[PDB]
Design a protein around this nucleic acid. Structure first.
Lengths: 107, 18, 71, 294, 76, 109
RNA sequence: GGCCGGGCGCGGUGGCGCGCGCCUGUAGUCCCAGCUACUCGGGAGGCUC
RNA sequence: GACACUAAGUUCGGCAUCAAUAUGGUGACCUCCCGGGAGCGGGGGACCACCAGGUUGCCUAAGGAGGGGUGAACCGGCCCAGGUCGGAAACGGAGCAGGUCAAAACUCCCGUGCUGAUCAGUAGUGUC
RNA sequence: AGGCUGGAGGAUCGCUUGAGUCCAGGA
RNA sequence: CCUGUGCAACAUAGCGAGACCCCGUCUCUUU
RNA sequence: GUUCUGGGCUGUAGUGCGCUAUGC
RNA sequence: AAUAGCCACUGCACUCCAG
RNA sequence: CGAUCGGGUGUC
RNA sequence: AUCGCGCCUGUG
C-alpha cells in the first residue's frame, strides 16, 4: 500500500509524456531513486528502496536511471504518518527541493 | 556441419545471460 | 627571170646584127665574181654574179653564142 | 537416469587411469566387474556376455595394453558398446501424408499416457492428431484418454462397447476427414496379461485399419519381462517400434540395453515423466554418453 | 698575138693561174671575117687570141669548156 | 561473404532441424552419447533471443558485408537496437562479437 | 713620114722611158733596160702614104 | 500581289507564385487539479506547428486552402510482431524491425504571372 | 696624110623617163 | 598639199653636143 | 596653239509637216 | 500620237584616207 | 523632260 | 514597287 515514486517524476530533463510530475521550476537535474530515499527517510518518512524496478517510460537501462522508492503515507488506521505530507505530490516536491542540498551533490 | 553449427548455437546461448 | 630573161635580150642582139655585136666575159677570181656582157656599142646589156651555181649556165651561153658565129 | 549402472561402470573404468599402463590380467578383472554390473542391471545375460567380449577385442585392438592411459581407451570402447547396444543411430517414425498408428502394450505399461504424449508431441511439430480409445470392453479405459486428450487439446474418438473394426474405421476416417486430422493415434485395450482373444481382435483391427506404425509401449521398470512381452506382441499382432516408459524410475536399464538384440525392434521414444510433456525421441548416443558421464 | 688552136688554150690556162691572187681575166667572143669567130683573152698585161672555125669547134669546145669550168671555181 | 542476415538464416535452419532431432539420434557415426543430456532446449532459446536482437536491425546493417563495422562507425545504432529488443547495450556488442567470430570461420570454411 | 690602143687612180725620176691597181677597145705588138739636162733610151716585126 | 501592325495559334525552354482570420482536426510542449499500490483512470487552463474545406483583407504583374513523391537506422505522425518495462493476473506503457499517412520536414508535376525561342502563317487593319 | 659617114670595148656638160627615192619642217 | 641642199668604194635610164680607137668610100695630075 | 574641204551608220544626240507601209 | 525603213546636216568620242 | 489621258483588262 | 505596276487603243 505504500506509494510509488520513480525518478522520472522528479527529473527536470524529462518532458511531461516522459514521466515528469512536477513543474520544471521545482524539478531536479538527475534525481536517483537512492537520493530520493535518502531524503525521505531523513524526515521521518517510512520508506524502502526497490533498487531494480524500472519505470515503464524509461528507454534507458543504465543504473543512475533506474530503481523505485516506496513511502508510507497513511497508517493502517488512516491517520497520515506526517501531517505535512498529505498527497504524493507533497513528497515529490519535498524531495525535488532537498536533493540539490545533499552533500553528495554540493560536492 | 552439425557439430560447429550446433555447438556454436549452444555455446552462444549459455554465454549470453539474457 | 633575170638570167633567163637576160639571155633572151642578148640572143636578140646577136640575131639583130651578128656582125656588129660582141660578147665580153670578165672573171675576177680574187674578189670572186663572174661577169658576162653582150654589147653592140649602142646597147650595154650586162650580167654579174658571185654565186657558184651560176658559172655553168654562163659558160654554156658563151659556148652557144660561139656556135651561132661559126654555124 | 541409469545412475545405478552408471556409478557402477564408473568405478570399474576409473580403476585404471591413475595406474598408468595396464596388464591383460587387470583388464579381465575390469571386464568381469563390467559384466557383473550389466547382469545386476538386468541386462539379458547373452547381451551382457557379448558386450564385455566386444569391449575386450575392441580394447585389445586399440592397443590398450600399450597405453599410458588405458582407462580412457576402455571408456571409448565401453561407450561404443553402450551406444550400439542402445540401438546405435537414433530413429523416429517416418510421417507421410496421413498417418495412422496403433499403441499396444499391457496394462500399466504407460500405453494410454504415451498415447497423449505422442499427440501432444506431434501437435507441437505442426500436426493435427486424433486420439482414439480402442478399448471395446471397458468404458473407464476410454474415459482415461478422453480426459488426457482434453488435457493436451487433442480430439478423442471413443469406440462403442463391442463395436466392430469396420464401424470404428468408418467413424475414425470420417472424423479425420471433417476435422482435418493427419495423425491418428489408436490406443488399444490394455490388459494385465496377454489375452489371446484380444490379440485376435487386435490382429483384425490391424487388418481393417491398416496402421502405418504399431508402437508397443513397455514399462522399463519391468526389466527383461518387457522383452518377453515384446516378443509375444510381435508374434501375436506385429510390432514396428517401441516406447520405453518410466525410464526416469528405471535405475537399472536392462530393458533399454537389451531391446535391440532381444526384440530386434527400434525404440522410437522414451517416457521420462507422468506429465503429457514427459516424452522425447530415444537417443542412444545421448544415453550411452550420459551413463558414462561423457 | 694570134695563136693556133692548141697554143691558145695553154696560154689561157696560164692567164687564170697568173691571176688567181689578183687581177681580172678577160675573154671576148666575136663573129669574124676579113665561117669563123675571133676569140681574145687578156689579163691586162699579156694579150692572146685565136680564130675558131666550124671545122674544129667540136674538138676545141671540148677542151675549152673543161678549161673554163675548172679554172673558174672560186665564186660563192 | 557472411552477412548478419546470413547468420540470421543459419540460425533459423538450425532451430528448425532441432526437433527432427529424434531421427538424428537414430543415426550412427556421431560417436558415443550423441545429444544427451540435454541442453538443446536452452541452446535454441539462445539463438531465438539473438534473432530478436537482429529483428531490431535494419536492411543496411543486415546486408552489410561487415555488419560489425557499421556499428563501429555509428555507435548510435547500437543504442537503438538495444532499445527495440529489450536488451542491454552490452548484449548487442556481444552478438556483434559472436557474429565476427562466426563470419571469420565461415570464410575459413 | 705617120699608126699598131684609150681611160681613172696611186707610185717612181729634175724629167723621159717606167712600176702597181681598177676600167675598156681594134682585122691589126713583141723584146730589152735604157737616156744623162733632154717634152729627145735601144732592137725586131706588121700596116699604111 | 509583296510587305507591315493588333488580335492570335504550335512547340521546346527560363524566371517566379501573398497576408491576415473563424470553426473543426492532428501533433508537440507547458501549467493546474481529482482518483489510484504500480503501468495509470479522470478533468481545466496556455502556447506553437501543421491539415480540412470556409471568409477576407483593399493585397501583388500573379498568388488556387490542386495532385503526386519521399519520409530519412534513430532523429515526422499513426498501427506496432517479437522482445522490454509495470503488473500475481487482467491488462497497460515506452518502443526497434515491418507496415502505414488529410495533417514535422523536404521535394516534384498542375494550374496561374511575366518570359526568350520556335513553327504557323489563318483573323482583321494599314501601306506600295 | 686629108675629108665624109657609122659604132659603141668604165659618161664632161645640158634636158626629161604619167610628179623617182615620202628623210625633215609647216606648234 | 607645199618647200629643201644628195643620189658612194659604176651599179641610170634615154636623147643631143660629140674627148684613143675601129670599119667603108674618094683624092694625092685639079686655073 | 581643242572645229579648211570631201568621203567612209563606227557609235550616240538633235532637226527636217519630209516620204512610204501597217499581216491586200 | 504608235512602230519600222530611207536619207541629209550639225556636235562629241574622235578615227582613217586624199587635196 | 517623248505629246494628249482618258478608257478597258489583270486590279497586287 | 517594271514602288511613272504591266498591256492595248485612238489622234491616216
Amino acid at each position: 500500500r505504500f506509494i510509488c515514486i520513480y525518478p522520472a517524476y522528479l527529473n527536470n530533463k524529462k518532458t511531461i509524456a516522459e514521466g515528469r510530475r512536477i513543474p520544471i521550476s521545482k524539478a531536479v537535474e538527475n534525481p536517483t531513486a537512492t537520493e530520493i530515499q535518502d531524503v525521505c527517510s531523513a524526515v521521518g518518512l517510512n520508506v524502502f528502496l526497490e533498487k531494480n524496478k524500472m519505470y515503464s517510460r524509461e528507454w534507458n537501462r543504465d543504473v543512475q536511471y533506474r530503481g523505485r522508492v516506496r513511502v508510507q503515507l497513511k497508517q493502517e488506521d488512516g491517520s497520515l504518518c506526517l501531517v505535512q505530507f498529505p498527497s504524493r505530490k507533497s513528497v515529490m516536491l519535498y524531495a525535488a527541493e532537498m536533493i540539490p542540498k545533499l552533500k553528495t551533490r554540493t560536492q | 556441419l552439425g557439430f560447429p553449427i550446433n555447438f556454436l548455437t549452444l555455446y552462444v546461448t549459455v554465454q549470453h545471460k539474457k | 627571170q633575170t638570167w633567163e630573161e637576160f639571155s633572151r635580150a642578148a640572143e636578140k642582139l646577136y640575131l639583130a646584127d651578128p656582125m656588129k655585136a660582141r660578147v665580153v666575159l670578165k672573171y675576177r677570181h680574187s674578189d670572186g665574181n663572174l661577169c658576162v656582157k653582150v654589147t653592140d656599142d649602142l646597147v650595154c646589156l650586162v650580167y654579174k654574179t658571185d654565186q657558184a651555181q651560176d658559172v655553168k649556165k654562163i659558160e654554156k651561153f658563151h659556148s652557144q653564142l660561139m656556135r651561132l658565129m661559126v654555124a | 537416469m541409469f545412475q545405478q549402472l552408471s556409478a557402477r561402470l564408473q568405478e570399474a573404468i576409473g580403476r585404471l587411469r591413475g595406474r598408468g599402463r595396464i596388464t591383460e590380467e587387470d583388464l579381465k578383472a575390469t571386464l568381469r566387474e563390467i559384466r557383473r554390473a550389466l547382469m545386476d542391471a538386468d541386462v539379458n545375460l547373452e547381451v551382457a556376455r557379448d558386450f564385455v567380449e566386444r569391449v575386450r577385442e575392441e580394447a585389445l585392438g586399440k592397443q590398450v595394453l600399450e597405453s599410458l592411459t588405458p582407462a580412457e581407451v576402455i571408456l571409448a570402447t565401453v561407450y561404443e558398446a553402450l551406444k550400439e547396444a542402445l540401438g546405435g543411430e537414433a530413429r523416429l517414425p517416418v510421417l507421410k501424408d496421413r498417418n495412422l498408428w496403433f499403441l499396444v502394450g499391457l496394462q500399466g505399461s504407460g500405453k494410454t499416457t504415451t498415447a497423449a504424449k505422442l499427440a501432444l508431441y506431434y501437435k507441437g511439430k505442426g500436426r493435427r492428431p486424433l486420439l482414439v480409445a480402442a478399448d471395446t470392453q471397458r468404458p473407464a479405459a476410454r474415459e482415461q484418454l478422453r480426459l488426457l486428450g482434453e488435457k493436451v487439446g487433442v480430439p478423442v474418438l471413443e469406440v462403442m462397447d463391442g463395436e466392430s473394426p469396420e464401424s470404428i474405421r468408418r467413424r475414425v476416417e470420417e472424423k479425420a476427414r471433417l476435422e482435418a486430422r493427419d495423425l491418428i493415434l489408436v490406443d488399444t485395450a490394455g490388459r494385465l496379461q496377454i489375452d489371446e482373444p484380444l490379440m485376435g481382435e487386435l490382429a483384425r483391427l490391424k487388418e481393417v485399419l491398416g496402421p502405418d506404425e504399431v508402437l508397443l509401449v513397455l514399462d522399463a521398470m519391468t526389466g527383461q519381462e518387457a522383452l518377453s512381452v515384446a516378443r509375444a506382441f510381435d508374434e501375436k499382432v506385429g510390432v514396428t517400434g517401441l516406447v520405453l516408459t518410466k525410464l526416469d524410475g528405471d535405475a537399472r536399464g536392462g530393458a533399454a540395453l537389451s531391446a535391440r538384440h532381444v526384440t530386434g525392434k527400434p525404440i522410437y521414444f522414451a517416457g521420462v515423466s507422468e506429465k503429457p510433456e514427459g516424452l522425447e525421441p530415444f537417443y542412444p548416443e545421448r544415453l550411452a554418453g550420459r551413463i558414462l558421464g561423457m | 698575138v694570134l695563136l693556133e688552136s692548141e697554143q691558145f688554150l695553154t696560154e689561157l690556162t696560164r692567164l687564170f693561174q697568173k691571176c688567181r691572187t689578183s687581177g681580172s681575166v678577160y675573154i671576148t667572143l666575136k663573129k669574124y671575117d676579113g665561117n669563123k669567130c675571133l676569140l681574145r683573152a687578156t689579163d691586162g698585161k699579156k694579150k692572146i687570141s685565136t680564130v675558131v672555125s666550124s671545122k674544129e669547134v667540136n674538138k676545141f669546145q671540148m677542151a675549152y669548156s673543161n678549161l673554163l669550168r675548172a679554172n673558174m671555181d672560186g665564186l660563192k | 561473404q557472411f552477412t548478419l542476415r546470413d547468420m540470421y538464416e543459419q540460425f533459423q535452419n538450425i532451430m528448425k532441424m532441432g526437433p527432427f532431432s529424434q531421427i538424428l539420434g537414430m543415426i550412427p557415426g556421431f560417436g558415443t552419447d550423441f545429444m544427451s543430456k540435454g541442453n538443446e532446449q536452452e541452446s535454441m532459446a539462445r539463438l531465438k533471443k539473438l534473432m530478436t536482437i537482429m529483428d531490431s536491425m535494419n536492411d543496411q546493417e543486415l546486408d552489410s558485408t561487415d555488419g560489425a563495422k557499421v556499428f563501429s562507425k555509428q555507435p548510435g545504432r547500437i543504442q537503438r537496437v538495444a532499445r527495440g529488443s529489450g536488451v542491454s547495450t552490452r548484449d548487442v556488442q556481444e552478438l556483434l562479437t559472436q557474429y565476427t567470430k562466426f563470419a571469420q570461420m565461415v570464410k575459413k570454411m
